[PDB]
mmCIF file of C-alpha atoms (C1' of nucleotides) in Angstrom:
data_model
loop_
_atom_site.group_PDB
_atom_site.id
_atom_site.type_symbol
_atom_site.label_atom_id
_atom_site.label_comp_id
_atom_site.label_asym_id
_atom_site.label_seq_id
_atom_site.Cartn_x
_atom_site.Cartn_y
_atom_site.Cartn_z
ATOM 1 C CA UNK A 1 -6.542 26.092 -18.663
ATOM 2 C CA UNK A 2 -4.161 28.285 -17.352
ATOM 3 C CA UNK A 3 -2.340 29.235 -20.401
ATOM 4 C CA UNK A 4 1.197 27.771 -19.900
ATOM 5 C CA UNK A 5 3.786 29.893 -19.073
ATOM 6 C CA UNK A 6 7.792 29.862 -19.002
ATOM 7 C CA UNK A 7 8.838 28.159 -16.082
ATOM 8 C CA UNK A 8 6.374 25.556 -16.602
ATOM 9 C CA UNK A 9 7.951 24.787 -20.284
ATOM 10 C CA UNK A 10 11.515 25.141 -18.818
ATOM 11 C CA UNK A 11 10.638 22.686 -16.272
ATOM 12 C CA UNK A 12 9.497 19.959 -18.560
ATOM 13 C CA UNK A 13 10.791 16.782 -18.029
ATOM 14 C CA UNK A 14 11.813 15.224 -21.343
ATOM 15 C CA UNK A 15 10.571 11.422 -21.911
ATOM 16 C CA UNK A 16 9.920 9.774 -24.963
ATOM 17 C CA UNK A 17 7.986 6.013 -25.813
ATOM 18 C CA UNK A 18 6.986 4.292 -28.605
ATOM 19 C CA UNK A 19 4.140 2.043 -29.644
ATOM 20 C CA UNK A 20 6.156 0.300 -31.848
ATOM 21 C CA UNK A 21 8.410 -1.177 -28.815
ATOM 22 C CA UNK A 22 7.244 -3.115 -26.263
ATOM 23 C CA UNK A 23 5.802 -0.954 -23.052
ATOM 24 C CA UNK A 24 8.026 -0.555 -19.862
ATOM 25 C CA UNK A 25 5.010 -2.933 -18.006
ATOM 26 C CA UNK A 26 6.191 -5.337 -20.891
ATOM 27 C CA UNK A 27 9.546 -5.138 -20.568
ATOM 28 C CA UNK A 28 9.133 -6.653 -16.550
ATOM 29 C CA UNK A 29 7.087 -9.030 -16.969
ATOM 30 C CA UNK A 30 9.945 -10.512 -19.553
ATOM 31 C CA UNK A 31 12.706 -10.434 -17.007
ATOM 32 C CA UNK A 32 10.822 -11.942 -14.031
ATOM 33 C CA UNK A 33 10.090 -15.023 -16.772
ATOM 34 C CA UNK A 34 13.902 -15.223 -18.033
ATOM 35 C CA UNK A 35 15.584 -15.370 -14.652
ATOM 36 C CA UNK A 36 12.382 -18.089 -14.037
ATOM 37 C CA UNK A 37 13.939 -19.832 -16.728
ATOM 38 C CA UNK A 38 17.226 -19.849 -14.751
ATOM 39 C CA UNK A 39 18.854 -17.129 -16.440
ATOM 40 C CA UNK A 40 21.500 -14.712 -14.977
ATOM 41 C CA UNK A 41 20.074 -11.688 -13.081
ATOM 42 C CA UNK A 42 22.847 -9.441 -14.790
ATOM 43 C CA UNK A 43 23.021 -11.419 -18.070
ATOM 44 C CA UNK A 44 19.645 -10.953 -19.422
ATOM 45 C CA UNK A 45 20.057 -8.829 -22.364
ATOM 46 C CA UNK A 46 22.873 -11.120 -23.447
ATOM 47 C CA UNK A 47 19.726 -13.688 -23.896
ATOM 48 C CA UNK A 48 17.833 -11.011 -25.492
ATOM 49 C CA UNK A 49 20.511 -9.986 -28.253
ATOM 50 C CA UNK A 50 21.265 -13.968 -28.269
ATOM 51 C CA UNK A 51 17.601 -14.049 -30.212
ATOM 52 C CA UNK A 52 17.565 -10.403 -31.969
ATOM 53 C CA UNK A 53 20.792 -11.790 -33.992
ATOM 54 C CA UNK A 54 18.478 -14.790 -35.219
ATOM 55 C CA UNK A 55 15.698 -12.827 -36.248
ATOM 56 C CA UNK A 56 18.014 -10.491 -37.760
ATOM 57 C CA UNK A 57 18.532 -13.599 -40.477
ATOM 58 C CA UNK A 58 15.575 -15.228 -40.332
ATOM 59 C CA UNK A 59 13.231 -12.920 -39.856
ATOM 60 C CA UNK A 60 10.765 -11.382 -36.887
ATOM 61 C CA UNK A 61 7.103 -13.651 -38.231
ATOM 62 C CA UNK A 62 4.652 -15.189 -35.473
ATOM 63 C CA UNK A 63 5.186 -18.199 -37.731
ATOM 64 C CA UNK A 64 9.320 -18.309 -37.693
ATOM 65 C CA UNK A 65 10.707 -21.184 -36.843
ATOM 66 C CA UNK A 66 13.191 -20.715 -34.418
ATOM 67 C CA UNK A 67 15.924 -23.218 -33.971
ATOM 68 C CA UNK A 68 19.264 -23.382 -32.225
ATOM 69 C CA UNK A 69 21.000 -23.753 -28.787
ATOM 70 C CA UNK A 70 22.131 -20.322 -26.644
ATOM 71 C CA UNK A 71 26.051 -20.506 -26.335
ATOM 72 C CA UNK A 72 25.231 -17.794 -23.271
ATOM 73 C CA UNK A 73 23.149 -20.110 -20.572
ATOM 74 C CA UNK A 74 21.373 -23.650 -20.911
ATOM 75 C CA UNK A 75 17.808 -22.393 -21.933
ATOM 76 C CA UNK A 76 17.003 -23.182 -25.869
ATOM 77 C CA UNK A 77 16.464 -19.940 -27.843
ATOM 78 C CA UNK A 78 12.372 -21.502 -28.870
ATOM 79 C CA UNK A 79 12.038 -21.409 -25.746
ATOM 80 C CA UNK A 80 13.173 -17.879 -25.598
ATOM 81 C CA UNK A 81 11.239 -16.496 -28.556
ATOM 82 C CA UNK A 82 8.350 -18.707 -26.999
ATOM 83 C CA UNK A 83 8.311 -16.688 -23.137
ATOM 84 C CA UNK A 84 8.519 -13.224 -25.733
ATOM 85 C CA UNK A 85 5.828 -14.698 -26.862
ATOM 86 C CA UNK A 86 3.644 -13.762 -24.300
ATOM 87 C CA UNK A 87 2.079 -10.553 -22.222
ATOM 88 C CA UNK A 88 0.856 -8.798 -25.934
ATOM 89 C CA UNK A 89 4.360 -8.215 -27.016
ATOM 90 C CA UNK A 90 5.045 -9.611 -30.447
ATOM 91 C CA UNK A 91 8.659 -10.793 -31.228
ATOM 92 C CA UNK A 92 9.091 -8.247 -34.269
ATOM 93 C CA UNK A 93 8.082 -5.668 -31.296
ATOM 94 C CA UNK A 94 10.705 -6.697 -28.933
ATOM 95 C CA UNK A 95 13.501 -6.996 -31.767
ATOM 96 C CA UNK A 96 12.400 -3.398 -32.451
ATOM 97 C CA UNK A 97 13.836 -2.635 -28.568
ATOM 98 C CA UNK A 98 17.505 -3.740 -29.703
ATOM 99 C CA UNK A 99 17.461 -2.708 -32.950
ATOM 100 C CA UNK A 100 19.555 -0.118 -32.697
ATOM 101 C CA UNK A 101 22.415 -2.491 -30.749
ATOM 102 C CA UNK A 102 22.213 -5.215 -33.644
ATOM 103 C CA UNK A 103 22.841 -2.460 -35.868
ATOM 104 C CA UNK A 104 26.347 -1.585 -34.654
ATOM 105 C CA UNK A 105 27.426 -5.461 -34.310
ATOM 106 C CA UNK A 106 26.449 -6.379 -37.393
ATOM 107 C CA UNK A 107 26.535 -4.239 -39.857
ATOM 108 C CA UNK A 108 29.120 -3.393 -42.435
ATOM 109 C CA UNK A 109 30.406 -6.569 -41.315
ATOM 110 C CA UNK A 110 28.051 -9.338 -42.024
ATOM 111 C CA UNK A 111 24.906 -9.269 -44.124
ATOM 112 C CA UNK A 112 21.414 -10.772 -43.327
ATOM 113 C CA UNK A 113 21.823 -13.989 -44.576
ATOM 114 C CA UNK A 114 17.777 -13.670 -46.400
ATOM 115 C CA UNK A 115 19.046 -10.715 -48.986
ATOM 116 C CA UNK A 116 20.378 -12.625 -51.658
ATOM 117 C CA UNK A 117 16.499 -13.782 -52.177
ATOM 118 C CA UNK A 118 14.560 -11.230 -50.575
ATOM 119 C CA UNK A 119 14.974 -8.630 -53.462
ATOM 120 C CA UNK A 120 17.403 -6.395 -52.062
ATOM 121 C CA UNK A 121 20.010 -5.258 -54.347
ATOM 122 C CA UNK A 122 23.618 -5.556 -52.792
ATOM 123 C CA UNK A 123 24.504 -1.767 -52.067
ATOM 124 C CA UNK A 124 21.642 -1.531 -50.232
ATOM 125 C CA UNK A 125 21.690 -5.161 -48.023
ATOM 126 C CA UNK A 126 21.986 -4.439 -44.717
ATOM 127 C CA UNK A 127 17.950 -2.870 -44.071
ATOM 128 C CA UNK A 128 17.582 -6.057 -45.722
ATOM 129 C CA UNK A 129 15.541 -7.238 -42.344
ATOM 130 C CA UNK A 130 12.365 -6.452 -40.595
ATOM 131 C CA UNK A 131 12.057 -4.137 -37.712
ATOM 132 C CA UNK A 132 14.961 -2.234 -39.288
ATOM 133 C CA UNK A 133 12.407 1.017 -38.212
ATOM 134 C CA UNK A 134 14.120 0.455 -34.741
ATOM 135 C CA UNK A 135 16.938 2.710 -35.426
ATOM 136 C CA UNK A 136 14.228 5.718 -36.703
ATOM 137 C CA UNK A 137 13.690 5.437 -32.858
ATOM 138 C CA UNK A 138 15.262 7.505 -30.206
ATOM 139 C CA UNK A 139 13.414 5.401 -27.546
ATOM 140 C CA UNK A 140 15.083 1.921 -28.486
ATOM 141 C CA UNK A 141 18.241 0.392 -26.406
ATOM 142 C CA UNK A 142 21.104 2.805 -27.447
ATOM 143 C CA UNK A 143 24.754 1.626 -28.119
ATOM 144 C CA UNK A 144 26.909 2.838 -25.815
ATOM 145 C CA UNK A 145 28.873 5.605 -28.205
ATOM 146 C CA UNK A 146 26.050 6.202 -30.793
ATOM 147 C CA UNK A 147 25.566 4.280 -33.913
ATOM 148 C CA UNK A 148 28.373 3.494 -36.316
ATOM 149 C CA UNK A 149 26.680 5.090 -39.535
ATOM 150 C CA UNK A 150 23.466 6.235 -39.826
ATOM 151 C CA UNK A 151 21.198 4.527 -42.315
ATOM 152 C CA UNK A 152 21.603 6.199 -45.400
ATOM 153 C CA UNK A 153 18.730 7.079 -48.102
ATOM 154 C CA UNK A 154 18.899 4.363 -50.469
ATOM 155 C CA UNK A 155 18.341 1.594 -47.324
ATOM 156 C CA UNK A 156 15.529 3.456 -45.957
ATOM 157 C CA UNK A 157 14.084 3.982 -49.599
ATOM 158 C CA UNK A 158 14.790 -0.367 -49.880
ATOM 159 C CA UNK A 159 13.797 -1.497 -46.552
ATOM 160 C CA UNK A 160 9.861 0.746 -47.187
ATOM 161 C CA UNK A 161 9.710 -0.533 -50.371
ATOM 162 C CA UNK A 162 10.702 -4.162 -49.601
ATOM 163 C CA UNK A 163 8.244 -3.842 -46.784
ATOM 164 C CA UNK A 164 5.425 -3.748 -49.034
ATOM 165 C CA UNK A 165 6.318 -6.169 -51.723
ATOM 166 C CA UNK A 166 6.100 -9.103 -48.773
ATOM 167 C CA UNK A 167 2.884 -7.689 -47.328
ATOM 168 C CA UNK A 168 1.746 -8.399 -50.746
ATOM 169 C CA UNK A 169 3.152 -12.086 -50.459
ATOM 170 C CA UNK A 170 1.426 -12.353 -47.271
ATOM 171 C CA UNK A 171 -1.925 -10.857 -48.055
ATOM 172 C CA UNK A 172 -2.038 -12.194 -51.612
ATOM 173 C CA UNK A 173 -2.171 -15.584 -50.135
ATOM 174 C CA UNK A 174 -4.618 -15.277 -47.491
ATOM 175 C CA UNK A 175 -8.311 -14.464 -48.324
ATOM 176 C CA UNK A 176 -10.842 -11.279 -47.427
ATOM 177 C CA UNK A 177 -13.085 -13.432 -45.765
ATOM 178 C CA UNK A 178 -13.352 -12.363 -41.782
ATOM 179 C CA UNK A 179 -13.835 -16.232 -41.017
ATOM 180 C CA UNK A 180 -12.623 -19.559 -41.592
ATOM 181 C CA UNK A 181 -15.777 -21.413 -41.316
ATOM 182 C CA UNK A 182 -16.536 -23.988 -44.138
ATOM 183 C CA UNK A 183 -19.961 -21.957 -45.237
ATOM 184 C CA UNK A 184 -18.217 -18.385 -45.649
ATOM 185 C CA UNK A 185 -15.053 -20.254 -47.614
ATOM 186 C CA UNK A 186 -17.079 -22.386 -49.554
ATOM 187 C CA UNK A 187 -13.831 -23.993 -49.716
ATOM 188 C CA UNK A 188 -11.624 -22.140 -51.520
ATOM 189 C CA UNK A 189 -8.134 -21.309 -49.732
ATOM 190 C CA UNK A 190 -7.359 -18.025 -51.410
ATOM 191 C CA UNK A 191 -9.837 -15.341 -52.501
ATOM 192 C CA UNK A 192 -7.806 -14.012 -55.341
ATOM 193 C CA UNK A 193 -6.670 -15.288 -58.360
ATOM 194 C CA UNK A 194 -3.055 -15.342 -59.605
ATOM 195 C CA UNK A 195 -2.291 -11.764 -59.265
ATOM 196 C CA UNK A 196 -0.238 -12.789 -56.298
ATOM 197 C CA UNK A 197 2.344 -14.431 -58.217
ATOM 198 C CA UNK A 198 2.606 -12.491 -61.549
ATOM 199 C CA UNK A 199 3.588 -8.667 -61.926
ATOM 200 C "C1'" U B 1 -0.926 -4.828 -36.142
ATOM 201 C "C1'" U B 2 0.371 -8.138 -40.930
ATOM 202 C "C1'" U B 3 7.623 -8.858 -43.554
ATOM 203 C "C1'" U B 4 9.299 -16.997 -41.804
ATOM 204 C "C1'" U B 5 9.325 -21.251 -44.685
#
RNA sequence: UUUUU
């Protein structure tokens, strides 16, 4: 190794990913499938924010449900979240991309509508959704002029603490058992008694 | 990676 010198660290090229967003390769084989579903050439990330505002409210899950007609084209949003669905990407991963975007048009200005019942006190209610870790991300979408406020302490403190109180609603209900299979079960649904709904 | 209901 040659033992790096000046020029060569002057002459870096600066370029930064993430594994938490979805990989350039990924974010292709999205756009060939959205103007396949008739969309606009230019207005694809119109589409794209069109479904990071829903899972800003509802949530970013494998298992969301989500419902409701695009007022941007004539493609159904499930059908949206469903083509996201696909290539590896998962739809929390690809909400992570735009993060930073939903920040500045929502916040300050409208809440998540899941914080009155997700624990989140009310100074501290709008981290109150997943991905929220997109704006700790220099390599997400950017808003044009920077974001309006940064996150402050108490919403990062919520949104890491809130993160593991529903990992522990979702792992308390499913069992340590590696297989499904009626012999391995023996039946029983959960693996764990109620500790998953007391303190 | 896992944060819906």
């Amino acid at each position: 190794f040659p033992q790096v010198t000046q020029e060569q660290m002057n002459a870096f090229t600066p370029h930064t990913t993430s594994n938490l967003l979805p990989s350039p390769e990924q974010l292709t084989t999205i756009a060939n499938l959205l103007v396949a579903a008739k969309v606009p050439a230019a207005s694809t990330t119109t589409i794209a924010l069109e479904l990071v505002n829903f899972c800003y409210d509802n949530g970013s899950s494998t298992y969301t449900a989500v419902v409701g007609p695009s007022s941007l084209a004539e493609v159904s949003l499930s059908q949206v979240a469903n083509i996201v669905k696909a290539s590896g990407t998962s739809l929390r991963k690809f909400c992570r991309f735009f993060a930073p975007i939903i920040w500045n048009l929502r916040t300050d200005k409208t809440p998540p509508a899941n914080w009155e019942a997700n624990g989140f006190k009310p100074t501290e209610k709008f981290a109150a959704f997943d991905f929220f870790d997109g704006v700790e991300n220099p390599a997400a979408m950017q808003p044009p002029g920077g974001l309006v406020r940064t996150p402050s302490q108490a919403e990062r403190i919520a949104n890491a603490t809130n993160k593991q109180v529903n990992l522990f609603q979702a792992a308390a209900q499913d069992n340590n058992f590696a297989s499904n299979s009626a012999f391995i079960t023996k039946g029983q649904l959960s693996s764990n008694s109620p500790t998953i709904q007391y303190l």
